[PDB]
């Protein structure tokens, strides 16, 4: 304030879950707690089992582009292999029908 | 890690293993495998039952000048050390151990609890460490020590040890090792699986 | 008999879609990558009926912290989740820390979801770490004065 | 139910008697949201005040009722043994107030598994209650074991 | 399928347009930088339908103050906006202090 | 805030940050283009069966 | 709206967004042609009975 | 990947700006020089992001 | 409006059915309510089962 005095308006609460993999993503970089993830355990930053908060900073995504590209290549090759299997079954069925 | 704190695979089948029983918990391999679970159950405190203080002593130390002993006066003793023990509720008791050289190779050690404000200052020898011809501890390496009663918690009595302590021409008296088997309550911070299959919660 | 080949093609398509989605959300503060988990579906016979996707598993590893600077921005380290509420009272969780004050002076993210926390009450206000979490507000009302009682 | 952990090193508050407005008059405050017969939310505040080592007076108040009487008598007394385990006083029958003519709810509040040892500070391990508010059908599902569940 | 990659390309293009607008406006008195904020589009399935541009956020950091020697030139330090009116009476707000 | 006469508030655009972000953005765009290329090859493979 | 003298309103066609739609529509067209070919083979195997 | 080099470049730019500001105030009565303080940004992995 | 004030004109209604699969498609991306689908339940967006 302007009177050389400050006030506290609130304290941001943090949530921790037993099962992180159980949280169902609802989009808009937002998660919703469900039965598999359990009930949310609430607390404050830096106390208990919570990490502290960094001010003036944002956490970026953990997506590495190189690994994604290589996995895309491998998955494309696997998809084409499965398509080859489908073609094999197609030729087998065609051979039997042409009998 | 599912909602019930069990280790399960993607399809939900529970991983099995040898469970841990007893205090301190150890893997008992004589039992049948059971599903592995990781509870958040706070860990309770353990009052101390065994403490150890390995220290090296200087031979050239002169005897204290200002007889009698006072825990207040620094010149009244040769050395002072601090060991933190824990009672039934996990409260910290800071045992101060005081070394006064009495005769050649003879060191009286006093024990005083500084965490209890109403505890009286010791006036009589708690133990007399005896060192042989060359450091080699001779007798008096183990003493029963009783804590004070703080905030209604049960006082923890324990065996305090001076084994493998030596007294030679070392430059000064400094503590080498202090250990104790007690701990204060703690909450689950992390969990890990070792390469030997043990699941360990920190 | 395409029982296996069709399932394999579907699993490969699902994995490729997951990879493409990960590629697309590369610049989404608060995004966690995903990986498909596959399982076989042997049923009675030994011929290996096919494959199925057992699920999609997130990768909840902390990303790089970039000092954008805007004061409201808050990055979260280690474990924890920011808690938000929509207009209908539902509770949601997010690692994205890009916040702004709306017209009613309510801390909201880009989508308008109200950030929640422990509110303060009393004079002087004290953080009600027990009080059920409430949306955080930053009123601009003028602050009253306290008569001197201790010096 | 309210499982809490209390610190054995907390000094006794100086400001006798206990006052809800006076923060210095109590050691810890917690909140539990219960629901009455009609479905109104009652934010029951539970206050822990240390009296003598191994003794904690517990007071209760209704923060949703504007006509609730100010608590002047200790609601119950938690006594922890020398090992920090709760011995007596862990259960008490508590009745809330009346809001807009709704029937007050009388429920048993239990402090089972609460422990007093040398923790960092007073922290509430868990809170729970078996009441709820009116709910509208949102979704339905069939689980793995065949049970049909409506959320 | 195609939708996820299309949304990713659109988001990357929007980010690049924001960067281009910022870099072309490097020399503009009173201009504030912009940054695109992205959000994912999960809907029911766990497949991660894609990403979308949640919005473009301005950065209202106080820029460097440059003197010019003109008596009608004034800059707002810290917070504050110049209030302006057009021909129709509509109100507007700007940090640029070049007046004539 | 106070007003400073005889001066203007310059832009807050730092050029080095813009250049680095441009490099990152272009690469992301190329990665997404590669994703589209992969899915296009997939659809071609399935059609040409 | 306002009128700006000495300026022209360019088109609103973005080439990138278009090329991608061209690829997608090409794939849809090829899929429909594949369906036509399938029905053609259906009629063939019925006729040759 | 890119974030590490981005953070390094931003730190170097901040240091350069601080040095330039200090030089610009070479003749400024009562001015005290400034110096940037740097710290690593390890987060979980042993790579040490930035 | 131009008088620095907004005015509401109406609210879009959303309809949910007990049986979506029972809806009879009429073409032109349009469905019609039938006995198999049951009577449509009307409401507002973002509330209940909408």
Curated annotation (Swiss-Prot), chain D:
Cellular localization per UniProt: Bacterial flagellum basal body
Lineage: superkingdom: Bacteria
Family: Belongs to the flagella basal body rod proteins family.
Identification of the protein by name: Flagellar hook protein FlgE
Organism: Salmonella typhimurium (strain LT2 / SGSC1412 / ATCC 700720)
Residues of the full protein shown: 153 to 303 of 403
From Swiss-Prot, chain E:
A cellular component term, taken from the record's GO annotations: cytosol
One BP term from GO: bacterial-type flagellum-dependent swarming motility
Domain of life according to the entry: Bacteria
Transmembrane portions of the chain: none
Family indicated by similarity: Belongs to the flagella basal body rod proteins family.
UniProt KW Acyltransferase keyword: no
Localization of this protein: Bacterial flagellum basal body
Keywords, in A-Z order: Bacterial flagellum
Gene (name only): flgE
Name of the molecule in the record: Flagellar hook protein FlgE
Cysteines paired by S-S bonds: none
UniProtKB/Swiss-Prot annotation, chain H:
Subcellular location per the Swiss-Prot or TrEMBL entry: Bacterial flagellum basal body
TM regions (residue ranges): none
Domain of life: Bacteria
Sequence similarity: Belongs to the flagella basal body rod proteins family.
Name of the protein this chain belongs to: Flagellar hook protein FlgE
């Amino acid at each position: 304030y302007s009177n050389e005095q400050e006030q506290v308006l609130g304290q941001i609460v943090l949530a921790n879950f037993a099962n992180n993999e159980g949280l169902a993503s609802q989009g808009d970089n937002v998660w919703a707690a469900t039965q598999a993830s359990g009930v949310a355990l609430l607390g404050t930053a830096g106390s208990g089992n919570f990490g502290k908060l960094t001010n003036g900073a944002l956490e970026a995504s953990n997506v590495d582009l190189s690994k994604e590209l290589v996995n895309m290549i491998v998955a494309q090759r696997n998809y084409q292999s499965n398509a080859q299997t489908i073609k094999t079954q197609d030729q087998i069925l065609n051979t039997l029908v042409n009998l | 890690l599912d909602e019930n704190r069990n280790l399960v695979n993607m399809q939900g089948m529970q991983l099995t293993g040898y469970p841990a029983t007893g205090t301190p918990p150890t893997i008992q391999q004589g039992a049948n495998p059971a599903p592995i679970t990781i509870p958040n159950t706070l860990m309770a405190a353990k009052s101390t039952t065994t403490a150890s203080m390995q220290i090296n002593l200087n031979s050239t130390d002169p005897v204290p000048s200002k007889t009698p002993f006072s825990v207040s006066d620094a010149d009244s003793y040769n050395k002072k050390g601090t060991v933190t023990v824990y009672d039934s509720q996990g409260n910290a008791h800071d045992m101060n151990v005081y070394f006064v050289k009495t005769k050649d190779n003879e060191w009286a050690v006093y024990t005083h609890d500084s965490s209890d404000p109403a505890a009286t200052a010791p006036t009589t020898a708690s133990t007399t460490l005896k060192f042989n011809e060359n450091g080699i501890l001779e007798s008096g390496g183990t003493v029963n020590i009783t804590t004070g009663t703080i905030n209604g918690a049960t006082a923890a009595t324990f065996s305090l040890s001076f084994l493998n302590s030596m007294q030679q021409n070392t430059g000064a008296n400094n503590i080498v090792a202090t250990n104790q088997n007690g701990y204060k309550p703690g909450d689950l911070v992390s969990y890990q699986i070792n390469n030997d299959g043990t699941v360990v919660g920190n | 008999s395409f029982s296996q080949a069709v399932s394999g093609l579907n699993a490969a398509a699902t994995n490729l879609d997951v990879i493409g989605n990960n590629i697309a959300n590369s610049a989404t503060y608060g995004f966690k990558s995903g990986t498909a988990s596959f399982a076989d579906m042997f049923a009675g016979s030994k011929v290996g009926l096919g494959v199925k996707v057992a699920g999609i598993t997130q990768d909840f590893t902390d990303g790089t912290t970039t000092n954008t600077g805007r004061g409201l921005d808050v990055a979260i380290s280690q474990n924890g989740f920011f808690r938000l509420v929509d207009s209908n009272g539902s509770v949601f969780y997010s690692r994205n820390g890009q916040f702004k004050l709306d017209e009613n002076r309510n801390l909201v993210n880009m989508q308008g979801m109200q950030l929640t926390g422990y509110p303060a009450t009393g004079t002087p206000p004290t953080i009600q770490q027990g009080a059920n979490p409430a949306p955080i507000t930053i009123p601009n009302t003028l602050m009253a004065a306290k008569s001197t009682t201790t010096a």
